[PDB]
Amino acid sequence: ALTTTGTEQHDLFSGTFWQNPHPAYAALRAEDPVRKLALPDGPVWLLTRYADVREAFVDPRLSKDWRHTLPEDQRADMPATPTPMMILMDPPDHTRLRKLVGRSFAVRRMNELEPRITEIADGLLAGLPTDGPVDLMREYAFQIPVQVICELLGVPAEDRDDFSAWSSVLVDDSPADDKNAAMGKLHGYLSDLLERKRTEPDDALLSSLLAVSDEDGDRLSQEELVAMAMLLLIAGHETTVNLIGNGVLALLTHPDQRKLLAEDPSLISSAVEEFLRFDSPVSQAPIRFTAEDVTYSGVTIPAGEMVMLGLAAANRDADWMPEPDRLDITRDASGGVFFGHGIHFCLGAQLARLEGRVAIGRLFADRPELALAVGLDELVYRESTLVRGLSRMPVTMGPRSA
Ligand code: HEM
Numbered sequence: 001a002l003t004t005t006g007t008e009q010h011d012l013f014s015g016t017f018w019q020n021p022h023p024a025y026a027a028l029r030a031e032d033p034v035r036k037l038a039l040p041d042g043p044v045w046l047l048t049r050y051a052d053v054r055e056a057f058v059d060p061r062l063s064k065d066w067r068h069t070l071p072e073d074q075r076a077d078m079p080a081t082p083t084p085m086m087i088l089m090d091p092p093d094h095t096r097l098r099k100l101v102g103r104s105f106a107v108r109r110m111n112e113l114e115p116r117i118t119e120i121a122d123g124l125l126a127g128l129p130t131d132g133p134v135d136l137m138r139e140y141a142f143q144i145p146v147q148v149i150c151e152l153l154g155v156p157a158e159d160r161d162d163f164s165a166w167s168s169v170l171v172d173d174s175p176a177d178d179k180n181a182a183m184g185k186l187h188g189y190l191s192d193l194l195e196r197k198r199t200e201p202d203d204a205l206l207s208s209l210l211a212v213s214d215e216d217g218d219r220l221s222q223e224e225l226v227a228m229a230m231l232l233l234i235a236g237h238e239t240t241v242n243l244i245g246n247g248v249l250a251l252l253t254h255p256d257q258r259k260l261l262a263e264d265p266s267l268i269s270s271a272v273e274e275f276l277r278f279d280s281p282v283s284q285a286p287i288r289f290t291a292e293d294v295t296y297s298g299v300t301i302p303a304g305e306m307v308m309l310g311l312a313a314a315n316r317d318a319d320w321m322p323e324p325d326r327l328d329i330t331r332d333a334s335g336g337v338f339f340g341h342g343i344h345f346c347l348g349a350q351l352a353r354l355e356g357r358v359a360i361g362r363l364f365a366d367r368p369e370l371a372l373a374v375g376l377d378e379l380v381y382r383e384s385t386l387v388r389g390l391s392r393m394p395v396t397m398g399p400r401s402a
């Protein structure tokens, strides 16, 4: 034929990356799939190809134990975790903690929460202004997961605002000092709340887990109790919020797919799968450590290195998804790493899908003329190597439905 070559170098975790990371991710899969990142907190490797990410998630040589950084002999002297969360642990501890809490997020248990969710969603849709510009993140995307997780756990939703500040400090790329403060406040708050729970119990998870703790220290230590609370609280809001944000923006930017869902509202399940694929809310999985030398797409990652798996990146891999940049809500897809894979698979996957489906299906039913109240390039993203997430979303809700 006849051709010319275009080069284009994209910012990785600075500048434009926060605005739109996908072109950066797309260059990575094709030319640099296993990439050492000189972050100012030392090297952290990034895997961007689907196959590779998938295999890594079940590769037993890839531990959640930070002591793999330190030489063999120093592993005894040090704690297994910064905080005894199951997401930061390998089996057998992980197994024990996940088994405790498993039943409480069972598929069908979450399914019967759906009417409650739908109520909460409608409650805000009944209460939002018809003409003004509203922030959809803080007034809608935030609320639904926060409120739901709080009612589930037994947290006074009076404190929504309080802990969510500390929560977004831990999730965003904050100074190491800033995060310590937040964890201390979270830990401190949750310790106090659990104490107040010894005096007066409810039906919710914390009450239940508290009893298991007190009655069988080997099943759940006090520290594991608090840390388990920190995790469900945090994974409570800071993930679904961005499924709802990203999922909404996707429809606003793709009038054709918006159209499809308006004519067949039952496409909502299929759509939520596509949103999670198309703009994955958890962009990179939390850090994994090499327990020993590994090799992916022909690149060795030494023993004792940190490793992020590129979730947002991998779900746009052509090798897995035909035409991966097309937003197609009609897809009947399987696999997809947005929720993880293997023994650490998202505990709230079903809950999250329900929140997504209701939050978005209801919003687009109740408000046909919903529109961005700003330019696409005016929207601001949180700087986080863990969530792809909007800070705010100015929109006009427009009139309601007849
Ligand atoms: C759309 C929103 C959500 C996304 C994108 C998401 C993503 C994930 C991913 C990718 C993992 C595995 C991390 C890894 O292997 O490194 C995960 C684990 C987990 N998630 Fe979800 N999640 C979402 C909603 C939730 C909700 C609503 C809960 C409710 C409690 C939740 C609780 C958990 C817990 C406890 C773990 C650790 C599981 C374990 O290690 O056994 N997440 N989340």
Ligand SMILES: C=C1CC[C@H](O)C/C1=C/C=C1\CCC[C@]2(C)[C@@H]([C@H](C)CCCC(C)C)CC[C@@H]12
Binding pocket: 066, 082, 087, 170, 171, 230, 231, 234, 235, 239, 282, 286, 287, 386
């Ligand atoms: C991990 C390491 C590895 C060890 C580093 O020294 C510090 C570090 C921070 C990460 C954290 C700490 C707090 C809890 C966090 C923020 C997790 C968070 C509570 C989970 C929410 C996302 C998940 C649901 C996918 C994800 C990353 C976790």
